[PDB]
Amino acid sequence: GPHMTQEEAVVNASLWEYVRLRESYDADTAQYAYDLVSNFSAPMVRQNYQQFFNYPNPTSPQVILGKHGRLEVEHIASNDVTPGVQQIRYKRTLIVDGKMPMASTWTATVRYEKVTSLPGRLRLTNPGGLVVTSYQTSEDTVSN
Amino acid sequence: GPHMTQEEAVVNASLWEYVRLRESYDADTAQYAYDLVSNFSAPMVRQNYQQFFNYPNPTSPQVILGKHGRLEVEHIASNDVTPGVQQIRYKRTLIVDGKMPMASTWTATVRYEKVTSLPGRLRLTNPGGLVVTSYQTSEDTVSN
């Protein structure tokens, strides 16, 4: 049967939560998401996420979607590429008012480290001490 | 330095996420939280939760608050009472239109088991294989 170590299970769960929190959007969960995403990103990753999410970015989901739209993420696969890097395929659905849900598929490439210590408030939401030290995402290319 | 095993870290995190998802309410997250809560619970726990949460229960958060209110949950403490039993103290805040945020403190009592095997889709969100087999919560009593 498909065997995994608990440690491997914890990695996969945490990185997917990471992707889900970062790629999803709802005005109600924006502040909760923002905090968790930021807490578990190394300084450059945190900067790049915050720069995109925060006002005054014109293309921030906050500005574009606000209270009248949302982005939903559904897992497809997680693949370990080397130690400390994982690729995550996922489908992203845009749900706005008056329009059909518009969907697209993506691969996040996530590099991560393990820190041995976290404050209690962080350990509680990140039991495995994971920190994302590199992050990029690419949307599938469409032709016709 | 205060030490914990990763197994114990994973427990505390999954049980708190259980509490948070079960005791929080947001119309946008209602379906997401309901499915994770349901999957994490053994048959009677699942049924107690579902009968409370679902329509036509006139006291469901969905019915009472709907789109116009939310319940937020702040961790306070997690205490292991016996193996497979944890008590979790948390503050619960009711946020409605035109009113100040109303807060109260609670103790959840949570018995859980470990299952060895989970479908992939469940392993992804419950790395440690935790299922809640008993669940009760009690709001602090008030006087004056």
From Swiss-Prot, chains A, B:
Membrane association type: Single-pass membrane protein
Keyword Calcium: no
Swiss-Prot/TrEMBL GO biological process terms: protein secretion by the type IV secretion system
Location within or outside the cell: Cell inner membrane
GO cellular component labels: plasma membrane; type IV secretion system complex
Top-level taxon: Bacteria
Protein name: Protein virB8
